[PDB]
Amino acid sequence: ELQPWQRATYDFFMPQNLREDLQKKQFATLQVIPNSGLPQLEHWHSLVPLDTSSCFGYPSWVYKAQNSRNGRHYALRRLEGYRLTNEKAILNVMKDWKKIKNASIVTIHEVFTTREFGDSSLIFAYDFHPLSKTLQEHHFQPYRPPPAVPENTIWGYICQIANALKTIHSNRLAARCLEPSKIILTDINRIRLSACAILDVVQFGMNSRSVVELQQEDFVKFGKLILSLATGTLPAHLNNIPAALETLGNKYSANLKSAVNWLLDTSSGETKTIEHFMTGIASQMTTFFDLALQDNDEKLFHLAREVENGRIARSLMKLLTILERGDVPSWSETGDRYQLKLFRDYVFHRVDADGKPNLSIGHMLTCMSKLEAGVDENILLTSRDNETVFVLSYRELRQMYDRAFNELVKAS
Amino acid sequence: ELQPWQRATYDFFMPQNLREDLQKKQFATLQVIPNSGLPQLEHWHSLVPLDTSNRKNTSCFGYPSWVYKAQNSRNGRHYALRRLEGYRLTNEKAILNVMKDWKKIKNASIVTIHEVFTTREFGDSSLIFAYDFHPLSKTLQEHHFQPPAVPENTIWGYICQIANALKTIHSNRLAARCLEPSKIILTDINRIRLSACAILDVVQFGMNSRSVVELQQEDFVKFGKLILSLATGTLPAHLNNIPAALETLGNKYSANLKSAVNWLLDTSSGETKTIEHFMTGIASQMTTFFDLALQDNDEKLFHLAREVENGRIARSLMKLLTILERGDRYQLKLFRDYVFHRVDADGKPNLSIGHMLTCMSKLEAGVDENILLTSRDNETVFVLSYRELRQMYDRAFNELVKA
Amino acid sequence: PLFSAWPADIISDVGAPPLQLEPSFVATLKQAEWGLYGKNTRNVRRNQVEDT
Ligand SMILES: Nc1ncnc2c1ncn2[C@@H]1O[C@H](COP(=O)(O)OP(=O)(O)OP(=O)(O)O)[C@@H](O)[C@H]1O
Ligand SMILES: Nc1ncnc2c1ncn2[C@@H]1O[C@H](COP(=O)(O)OP(=O)(O)OP(=O)(O)O)[C@@H](O)[C@H]1O
Ligand SMILES: [Mg+2]
Ligand SMILES: [Mg+2]
């Protein structure tokens, strides 16, 4: 119902949905409990529980916490009743996984034991991702049955996981946990492995399998995860792999069936490598490279507009500081400042032909932007009396505006 | 040697200085020229030339070409206008058919084409192509050939983005016809976009008889030559001896790069080359650059979250400016004086931004905390809460709204 | 009601070209090193919305 040249007030600002998502996540990050019984660890405080209600060998809790050195928020995963018996279990694993930096893996910053919860506990410190939900929560939570995962979403998942496995396997490690419950949606279609270091520590020195063997099992788990998502059945419920594969074959492309089958197939004589798997999904990967860049551009668009809102804001403050001071005498009403007052009237005190005041936010933002830029465009400022008129460029105005402000700075 | 791409640092798409970059690009978008000779077109105004040097060069299109930043009057947005000077369109079907194909195309590695139109408004026959505007873009030619070794990673990054463009173009039964360094623009750090896509399709519309598949095979060769030019620092026209250039590349870079470039150059294999086959061969690199794109996504989101309140702060300051001094009101004037006209004990002005933000924040919220507004001469004084103040300002504003 | 809240249904124009003045009129103005000033002859309300 709006002409292409005309904008509603809020079109000049960040769209409501994005604004609300950011605000909610800001709120989730800043949430605290002033007097919980929960302890402060030496470098961690303001612990906040996240558990609404498996992969590890211990009962586990997750807390949002704030680091005392840098003031940032991290997610602390606690394993209850873990006893330190070999420090290498903690130290070697921490050394290895601290190297790992990957967009599809929740970063591990620290692994440490503590008695501060009143038991022996093992703590893993992670990047905090506000308002995250697991793939299990998102796809398998009943009521009504959960809807069919679109094939495109699945290839998006496959590519992000392949990205994780590429980095994990190259560092001679294995992503050991690939359950829906230990993969988190940190944003729309954006998934991250969230429990990576943990299995390495708990099974340290008890596991007899080689690195390569654990890596082979990663592919099988990868396949079962996709199979769970395709057919809507929990991994625990996946009793019949072939029956699940056929369901997938009916609902999805042959290309997907082939990918899942390669991942499940332990019968070939061939050592499976993430390199070979990537080779088989190059086209999908290219598509998602493109979409990532497009999403970058979208975020950059909004970022550029809000940074400019900030610059405008600081400029409006400078304006208010300069105009109508109680004051040399009359400094505000004389010389450079006089034009600035007339400029303010031009920007903010517009009126229709009918004399009705005009409140178009678009005019105000643009004018302040042009002033900041010192544009070579002329405008017509009229005296309050209405007898006299002045024609100035924004460039000229900026010179005046800067001079007026620098005078105040000098006065110090 | 998978190592060069495996090594690439995580900041590959992240700007060195985001603050300065945004500010420069903001200024570039609003720039105009006080006395250009340039015309206003029916839907276009504020034309600004972007060509650094005013020299007639016709290399890719066969005609002199200019690029203008311009502002569309239909929607208020800025576009980049490619003008072919002295070009007369002889078949109108050329624009309609070509645009039907290319308007579908939306790709991170291709500058979107929106419109093609003829005009006499420059004082000649001219053909105009309207593109997305990318402020402060520079061509690969300007950037790599303007009087050191391009790192292999930068090259793989370029290769992945160009492959991304070619995937979309070839899938839509089209051909990127121009793959010259001068027609690929860096719109951001290590970020390239094909900038001349629609043009050859239009200019040669009747004349070119080669098939779609034939023009695509040529994409690969041109692609190969671009990489070869960058690797060895010699412009594509000077690339007289390809085998000699290939050995040079083989000495400075990995066997994988030599192999990829060789596949792109090879017309002898008897095999129809496909972008699907090429992507398959660079899958590892593509995954790395997918990761790097996503990490930049996280970086941008971080800054976005930090800047989210700026609109709210700006609108508040605007209402203050909208209400005051048009020609209760006295308290309002005193509040503005309290916030922005602070003075030191010595009578000198105080410019602490912190005071202004805290005050505007408390006003915004309508906090109950009480403040003391006094005229500088102490005769009159008021003790009010911010809650009371917001009530007052809003009433004034609602009066203004009524109209 | 937050103070930052502005009315949603207000419309702005964004496409318009910059103000072009009649050359006759510009002659009326008396040049200064920072710009031009003169007597308002036009029948436009002060700071009125201009349709370019
Ligand atoms: N790194 C993280 N940042 C933010 N939130 C996280 C992070 N890791 C996990 N969480 C959140 O903690 C919550 C609990 O996760 P957890 O995996 O412990 O429970 P679960 O998967 O429901 O358990 P179960 O496997 O028994 O069903 C989830 O909603 C998840 O989004
Ligand atoms: N979509 C765009 N947005 C912003 N700037 C662009 C866009 N496309 C091209 N430019 C810029 O316009 C300038 C001129 O580009 P153009 O390719 O026309 O000339 P050139 O490459 O310098 O010389 P030649 O025309 O001989 O190739 C370049 O600096 C380029 O970065
Ligand atoms: Mg839990
Ligand atoms: Mg040019």
Numbering used by the authors:
A (entry chain B): 207 to 259, 265 to 353, 359 to 543, 547 to 631
B (entry chain A): 207 to 353, 363 to 542, 555 to 630
C (entry chain E): 355 to 406
What wording appears in the published article?
Two conserved complexes carry out the majority of deadenylation in the cytoplasm: Pan2–Pan3 and Ccr4–Not. As illustrated in Fig1A, Pan3 contains a zinc finger at its N-terminus, a pseudokinase domain (PK), a coiled coil and a highly conserved C-terminal domain (CTD) (Brown et al, 1996; Christie et al, 2013; Wolf & Passmore, 2014). Pan2 contains three functional domains: an N-terminal WD40 domain, an inactive ubiquitin C-terminal hydrolase (UCH) domain and a C-terminal exonuclease (Fig1A) (Boeck et al, 1996; Wolf & Passmore, 2014). In conclusion, through combined biochemical and structural approaches, we have shown that Pan3 is required to couple RNA binding to the Pan2 exonuclease activity.
The best diffracting crystals were obtained with a construct that lacks the first 27 residues of the PID region, ctPan2343–458, had P21 symmetry and diffracted to 2.6 Å resolution with two copies of the complex in the asymmetric unit. Molecular replacement using the structure of ctPan3 PKC showed clear difference density corresponding to a single ctPan2 chain (comprising residues 355–406) on each ctPan3 dimer. The overall structure of the ctPan3 dimer in the complex closely resembled that obtained for ctPan3 alone (Cα RMSD 0.94 Å), although there was a slight (˜6°) rotation of the C-terminal domain relative to the coiled-coil and pseudokinase domain (Fig5C and D and Supplementary Fig S6C). The major difference between free and Pan2-associated ctPan3 was a substantial rotation of the N-terminus of chain B (residues 207–224) by approximately 90° toward the Pan3 CTD (Fig5C and D). The PID of ctPan2 exploits the asymmetry of the ctPan3 dimer by wrapping around it at the interface between the pseudokinase and C-terminal domain (Fig6). In particular, ctPan2 Phe357 and Trp360 are inserted into a pocket of ctPan3 formed by the C-terminal domain of chain A and the coiled coil (Fig6C). The PID of ctPan2 next passes over the coiled coil and interacts with the N-terminus of ctPan3 chain B (Gln212–Ala214) through an intermolecular antiparallel β-sheet (Fig6E). This new β-sheet is located between the pseudokinase domain of chain A and the CTD of chain B. The PID continues around Pan3 to form extensive interactions with the CTD of chain B that include an extended 4-strand antiparallel β-sheet between a β-hairpin of the ctPan2-PID (residues 384–393) and a β-hairpin ‘ear’ in ctPan3 (residues 597–612) (Fig6A). Finally, residues 399–403 of the PID of ctPan2 bind in a highly conserved groove formed by residues 599–603 and 562–573 in the CTD of chain B of the Pan3 dimer (Fig6D). Collectively, the interface between the PID of ctPan2 and the ctPan3 PKC dimer buries a surface area of approximately 2,230 Å2, and the ctPan3 PKC dimer interface buries approximately 3,740 Å2.
